[PDB]
Amino acid sequence: GSSGSSGFKVPPFQDCILSFLGFSDEEKHSMEEMTEMQGGSYLPVGDERCTHLIVEENTVKDLPFEPSKKLFVVKQEWFWGSIQMDARAGETMYLYEKANTPESGPSSG
Incomplete structure (x- = not known):
């Protein structure tokens, strides 16, 4: 692969x-194009x-597949931040652990 x-x-x-x-499809797209803009x-x-897997633990509970340990799965923040600071953050800080957060959808109860 030749670079430039x-x-x-x-x-x-x-x-x-x-x-x-x-x-x-909208929020994702934006991310796709962004990745390229950053590099x-x-x-x-x-x-x-794929080397990294950014899953939205906000609306995602479990992955549709069983990825290998090699694949570093992180949250959505990881991607965002890295862009804001333009620096590859540590996955160990955004490691996705199927963390289930409250108020997933309908807050009112």
Whole structure:
């Protein structure tokens, strides 16, 4: 794979793919294009070619598949932040643990 970067700077997603699962075709798209703008790639869920998996624990409880340990699954924040600070944050800080949060949908009760 031939590259074309003439600089001492590197993107927060350099040679790193990000998969989004849960967000709406709209919210997701935005992320897909973004990844490229920053300096990374984006692939459809399932493709093992993906290195990182960003799942929305807000509306997602369990993954539709059983990924390997190699794949680092994190929350949605991880992706966002990294972009805001333009720096690859630590997955151990956004590691997705099927964390189920309250008020998932209808708050009123």
